Write a protein that binds this DNA or RNA. Structure first.
Ligand SMILES: *O[C@H]1[C@@H](O)[C@H](n2cnc3c(=O)[nH]c(N)nc32)O[C@@H]1COP(=O)(O)OP(=O)(O)OP(=O)(O)O
Ligand SMILES: *O[C@H]1[C@@H](O)[C@H](n2cnc3c(=O)[nH]c(N)nc32)O[C@@H]1COP(=O)(O)OP(=O)(O)OP(=O)(O)O
Ligand SMILES: *O[C@H]1[C@@H](O)[C@H](n2cnc3c(=O)[nH]c(N)nc32)O[C@@H]1COP(=O)(O)OP(=O)(O)OP(=O)(O)O
Ligand SMILES: *O[C@H]1[C@@H](O)[C@H](n2cnc3c(=O)[nH]c(N)nc32)O[C@@H]1COP(=O)(O)OP(=O)(O)OP(=O)(O)O
Ligand SMILES: [Mg+2]
Ligand SMILES: [Mg+2]
Ligand SMILES: [Mg+2]
Ligand SMILES: [Mg+2]
Ligand SMILES: [Zn+2]
Ligand SMILES: [Zn+2]
Lengths: 647, 224, 222, 221
RNA sequence: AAUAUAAUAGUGAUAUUAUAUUC
RNA sequence: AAUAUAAUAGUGAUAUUAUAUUC
RNA sequence: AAUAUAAUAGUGAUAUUAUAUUC
RNA sequence: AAUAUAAUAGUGAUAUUAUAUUC
């Protein structure tokens, strides 16, 4: 191995036993820094003593990568490397696994949970901690929970030995600071969270660092919105006719905006609490209102999609929607709405088949891609968009475009509800830096709004000299946001370089002050009468709160053979094992093919049981009759009977 | 009020009144039903609007007479001769008893008998312990719904958990059950709920039982 | 991933629980064969039970490679993969390390020494054993020592449950045999050393294999 | 349909705790036993199975319990058998124990078979139920079995041990002249059965007193 | 043949008897 | 999934439904 | 179920949606 | 320190060397 000088320079404060936040550009090879710090830390101990290192990776790919590298590197030195992730965390002696290994790679939630249970009594068992992407240490994030434990031990009278804390990040961030001084405050608070007395940056060796990681040139493309909407002109008529149908049953803002989305969601939640003496009629009209607001929401989504993409993509979005609706079953209301939609279908497809209507944004994007690939046919591009719908949209737009034929698109999204041939990779977003992918000498941000940290991190894809990053937007605000983010970066670097000049002792004192203050701030009746849980769509009786049991102070299940008649089920599209639970199938409302999503069906220990979310139900008090809606089970306040296997 | 009881069954409370409402049965069940009338003075009414039913059970009474008379005849025979005749009949029956169609390997299509939706392929169908038929692949899982079984039972090595129905446009036709078999959680389907379309030919045929359906039946292997 | 048919064919005798010597050309992807057999072995157990697989690599590079691949493969399925080599073997609770992990990669000398020391009381702790380059099982080689323990337990009076044994080799070897009968005897003795009742080779799928591993033309320059 | 106090008495046992169940005669301890056994057998995962042994000290109680358990657990797929002095001889006791989930025994059978060696350890059972457990003391067969249990526990055998459930209407204070000595005797009895819990009816007492009434006692001198 | 309980004698281990059970 | 019985069409093997049972 | 980020509404604790992650 | 392979000398057990590996 042959480490670069700036890596030794960055690792030097940590090797001196100083708690250190290491701030260096993305792709500078921080992994080697970690290896150096750990190697020195482990080899520094005398014979009668030994060190224990814990590395925190926030995402599974980084987890496996780091575990592999550390194992391959430190096996020859006589240090056992292991790891505990969510998959392997259950039914294993975590305490022994920690005790029997020198280097342990961990996702932070494991440590938070094991500290909370008490299986790992103290953080004193580790002599060194390393936080990957340490800028995440703040608020309620698992990192910050770990550090809550740490600081609770430090500031307390336990007087147990504490591990050296080493953070790693490309950007510490200035937060919401409007000026350099406030930025200094934020950074100091972050250093207090990680108990770090030193911020390590490349200074002496900068000339070496700049020959490795290069800063890509950033261009701002400000375009115009499409001049005339025929599509929105006619679909506003379907929104109007749908809210007119809603205007029949009600007894009681712009289209294509987030304001309308908020409004229609609040309306949808308002329709669920309406009540009548006749309950079946109530179910009919509530199902009706739910369906109307749903179609309204989908239409709105179509408007937005076509604002940011082709009108064909919005049309196909609606067509996919109604395809699914047809798959659901025949409902009078759904059949009606689909009918009125199908009446306007000819006119619609007439209006997106025209070449005249192509949006200025896609034209400009096409121009960018054309020019850049004309100059360099070997160009690898990465295209960031806000939503997955837009991912599919541009995916189809590229190969549906004859001029873009040189492009070989690919898809990168999340899992949940050069030498290869992919020239361009369309993606939503990637948490922090992540695993290094192929170097993109072209980065296109399409209506992208990030923070300063994500801005600095996205440069890691542009490490090569001559990389370029375009920001294409019709909003004209986005430009300003990115600019003030650049200014935020300036504030950050300046404040850091100012902090580095302070005497370390004084800084430790300020840090201790902040920590104690934050600890002071941090240290600062359930209803017993039965409630009913009704479907949010068809208002059908699902459960009684007397039948609800709480597993592990988190998940909620139902007891009795009565509930088994209220739901149907189909195998889960994305089977996943969370905690001690194993997902098997999805459960839906069984009454008259309502099919509203109630929750999941899981295997827990020996039991096969349903788990429901309060978000999908309406809570009716038997005594008062008052119906209420609830965020999550945390905000629903009633006495929750623990799940008892012997019951 | 009851439907029927196989043979004598467990001994019930004595009924001095037994009423047969449009009831038709054999001689054996006739003689067995008397067991509920053991006490003196018990009565049995046969109530029907059919001039036939009465006739049925009186020819049954005649059958009983024939039975008793025949037994009384057999009891007069010499045991050796009876053994000989019995042996003769046994050998005959064994001779008659001691006295397979070529399977089709063409891939068929199992369609829902109700909505004609494609459910399964005969390449996906695997047979467990010569009797029960399952469907492999994740393709099938999107074709069916499931409801918790109203009467869960354990038969042989299988445990019933849910009933499975058609998923398309709320067809909800009964395709079979969903069971726990050894380590595996797997669906079991009945051929009587499906129509077989060989789309090489395009011909649709109906089978009531699996053993009357002759195609290539591959054994279920845990090693697949 | 997408396994080639001859790999499934080679793994099939092992997935049926038979102790099996797998004999296939070098570079046919035996790694994925091991992954297949191991995955099937671990997933076959009911809920209340679990298996323990031990992989024997004779060399440190092979040790690290296999440990890495197995770790990256089986972490998602909820199986802990670890290893013990000469560097990490000292002053560690080897028994606990074996106990607390589902898949364990060892250099054979660790198991030999720890069996002799008594820290590992029996091979009954493993439900499966895989020998890389299993032709090395003979004479005083560590593999053969391990198998001496195995066979002493098997042929001994009190015998607990024994692990399935899978060997992996490109060539079993004929020894010094001058004819097919002596060769047959050598191969049978090797199978006896590994307690293997089956020798798995590629037969049905030969064309596919010959499209992957080609036999180089050999010239002799005198 | 069980009475509430029966569930209350069964609850500590169903939680896996070694328990001495103390309730008045006639409260229906049989159903308590049935509940404990049922929950104990059903709690095991697929790859494992439990084995329950029920000690009845007298042949009538032996036959009664055997009949009741056989009739009750046949449905759930648990084979119930028994061994008394009549059928104890010239039979493979080890196989009979191995091949059945619930085994009803008179204590002498298990003592004899333990010291003979046919049953190597009590680890073969996942649950033990002593009927009239107050009899566990001195040289009584119950106490001999428990001597095997404790010899295994306090030793370095490191084998798994069965959950122990006693059943009695009275534990007894022995010769105790005061509450302290009584406490000591009861503690020693708990030690004998390795029980950390004594289950009595508390919440449901009013229901229990509608079932078993206390008769009036007169003294004629 | 073993075990339990009660009475009695003995400082006690125990001993006698009565009663019951088990193998 | 198998088995038995009854009614019903067929000369019959069978077939449909009903009823019951077993694995 | 928890967490983070972004936009939107609100003076704010927050709320909605979007995106991503973890257990 | 142990193990394997190859060549060699010897009828063989082995022995020398070469080579590789492991603890
Ligand atoms: O020493 C005793 C013993 O060896 C033998 N004996 C008599 N009954 C039993 C028994 O129930 N169990 C065992 N193991 N051994 C037994 O008889 C010897 C003495 O004879 P007894 O006269 O005392 O016994 P008997 O049957 O004549 O009288 P009883 O015991 O019924 O009252
Ligand atoms: O083909 C049948 C069969 O394989 C299986 N099956 C259902 N019940 C049993 C049984 O009692 N014994 C055996 N050996 N096999 C059984 O199910 C397949 C058909 O499913 P069904 O829908 O007909 O079964 P279901 O439970 O839904 O109805 P029912 O027979 O109990 O009344
Ligand atoms: O209330 C939730 C929760 O109890 C449970 N649940 C589902 N996924 C998880 C998980 O990853 N981690 C934890 N701790 N708990 C989980 O399901 C209830 C809600 O059901 P959902 O319909 O939201 O779950 P579903 O799988 O359908 O959607 P998603 O998990 O993919 O987002
Ligand atoms: O007798 C040997 C032995 O006791 C000891 N020794 C040296 N290396 C090892 C080893 O790798 N493993 C074991 N078990 N024992 C070892 O040294 C004695 C002989 O010393 P050498 O001069 O022959 O060894 P050296 O390190 O000088 O050279 P080398 O081992 O590379 O050949
Ligand atoms: Mg191979
Ligand atoms: Mg298992
Ligand atoms: Mg060796
Ligand atoms: Mg079980
Ligand atoms: Zn509903
Ligand atoms: Zn259908």
């Amino acid at each position: 191995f042959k480490p670069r000088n700036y890596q030794l320079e960055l690792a030097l404060p940590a090797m001196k036993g100083k708690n250190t936040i290491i701030c260096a550009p993305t792709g500078c090879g921080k992994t080697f820094v970690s290896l150096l710090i750990c190697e020195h830390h482990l080899k520094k101990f005398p014979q009668g003593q030994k060190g224990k290192v814990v590395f925190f990776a926030n995402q599974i790919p980084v987890y496996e990568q780091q575990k592999s590298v550390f194992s391959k590197y430190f096996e020859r030195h006589g240090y056992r490397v292991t790891g505990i992730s969510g998959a392997t965390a259950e039914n294993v002696p975590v305490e022994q696994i920690v005790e029997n290994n020198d280097i342990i790679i961990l996702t932070p939630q494991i440590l938070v949970n094991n500290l909370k249970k008490g299986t790992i009594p103290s953080l004193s068992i580790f002599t060194l901690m390393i936080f990957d992407e340490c800028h995440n240490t703040s608020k309620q994030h698992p990192y910050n929970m770990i550090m809550f434990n740490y600081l609770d031990q430090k500031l307390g009278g336990s007087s147990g030995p504490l591990p050296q804390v080493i953070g790693l990040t490309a950007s510490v961030g200035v937060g919401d600071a409007k000026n350099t001084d406030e930025a200094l405050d934020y950074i100091c608070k972050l250093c207090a969270s990680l108990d770090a007395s030193v911020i390590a940056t490349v200074k002496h060796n900068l000339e070496e660092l700049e020959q490795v990681v290069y800063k890509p040139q950033k261009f701002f493309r400000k375009v115009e919105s499409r001049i005339s909407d025929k599509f929105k002109y006619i679909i506003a008529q379907l929104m109007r006719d749908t809210e007119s149908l809603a205007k029949r049953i009600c007894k009681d803002r712009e289209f294509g905006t987030q304001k309308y989305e908020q409004w229609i969601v609040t309306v949808q939640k308002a329709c669920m609490v309406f009540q009548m003496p006749d309950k079946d009629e109530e179910s009919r009209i509530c199902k009706a209102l739910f369906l109307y607001t749903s179609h309204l929401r989908k239409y709105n989504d179509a408007l937005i999609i076509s604002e940011h993409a082709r009108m064909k993509d919005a049309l196909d979005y609606l067509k996919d929607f109604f395809s699914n609706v047809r798959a659901a079953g025949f409902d009078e209301i759904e059949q009606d709405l689909t009918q009125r939609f199908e009446e306007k279908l000819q006119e619609l497809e007439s209006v997106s088949r025209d070449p005249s209507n192509e949006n200025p944004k896609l034209e400009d994007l096409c121009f960018i891609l054309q020019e850049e690939y004309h100059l360099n046919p070997e160009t690898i591009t990465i295209l960031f968009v806000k939503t997955r719908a837009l991912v599919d949209a541009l995916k189809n737009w590229i190969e549906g475009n004859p001029k873009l034929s040189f492009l070989k698109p690919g898809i990168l999204t999340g899992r949940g509800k050069a030498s290869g041939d992919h020239n361009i990779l369309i993606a939503t977003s990637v948490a922090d830096e992540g695993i290094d992918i192929a170097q993109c000498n072209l980065v296109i941000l399409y209506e992208y709004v990030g923070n300063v940290i994500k801005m600095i991190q996205t440069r890691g894809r542009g490490r090569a000299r001559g990389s370029k990053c375009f920001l294409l937007t019709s909003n004209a605000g986005v430009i300003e946001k990115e600019q003030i983010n650049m200014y935020k970066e300036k504030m950050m670097n300046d404040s850091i370089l100012r902090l580095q000049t302070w005497d370390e002792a004084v800084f430790r004192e300020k840090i201790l002050h902040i920590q104690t203050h934050e600890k002071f701030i941090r240290d600062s009746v359930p209803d017993k009468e039965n409630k009913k849980l009704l479907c949010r769509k068809c208002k059908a009786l699902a459960c009684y709160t007397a039948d609800v049991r709480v597993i592990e102070e988190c998940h909620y299940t139902v007891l009795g053979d009565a509930f088994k008649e209220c739901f149907v089920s189909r195998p889960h599209p994305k089977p996943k094992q969370f905690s001690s639970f194993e997902k098997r199938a999805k459960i839906f409302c069984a009454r008259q093919n309502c099919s509203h999503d109630w929750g999941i069906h899981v295997k827990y220990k020996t039991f096969e049981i349903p788990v429901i979310k309060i978000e999908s139900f309406v809570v009716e008090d038997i005594a008062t009759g008052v119906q209420t809606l609830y965020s999550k089970w945390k905000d629903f306040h009633f006495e929750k009977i623990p799940f008892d296997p012997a019951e | 009020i009851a439907t029927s009881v196989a043979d004598e069954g467990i001994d019930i409370a004595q009924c001095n009144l037994v009423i047969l409402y449009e009831y038709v049965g054999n001689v054996i069940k006739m003689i067995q039903t008397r067991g509920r009338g053991r006490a003196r003075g018990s009565k049995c009414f046969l109530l029907t609007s059919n001039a036939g039913v009465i006739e049925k059970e009186q020819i049954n009474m005649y059958k009983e007479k024939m039975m008793n008379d025949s037994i009384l005849r057999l009891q007069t025979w010499d045991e050796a001769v009876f053994r000989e005749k019995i042996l003769h009949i046994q050998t005959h029956e064994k001779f008659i008893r001691d006295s397979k169609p070529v399977p089709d390997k063409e891939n068929k299509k199992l369609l829902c008998r109700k909505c004609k939706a494609l459910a399964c392929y005969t390449a996906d169908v695997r047979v467990i312990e010569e009797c029960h038929y399952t469907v492999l692949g994740d393709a099938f899982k999107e074709c069916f719904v499931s409801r918790p079984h109203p009467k869960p039972k354990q038969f042989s090595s299988f445990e019933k958990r849910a009933k499975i129905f058609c998923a398309r446009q709320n067809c909800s036709h009964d395709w079979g059950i969903h069971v726990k078999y050894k380590t595996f959680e797997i669906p079991v389907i009945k051929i009587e709920s499906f129509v077989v379309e060989d789309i090489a030919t395009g011909v649709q045929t109906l089978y009531s039982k699996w053993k009357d359906f002759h195609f290539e039946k591959i054994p279920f292997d845990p090693a697949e």
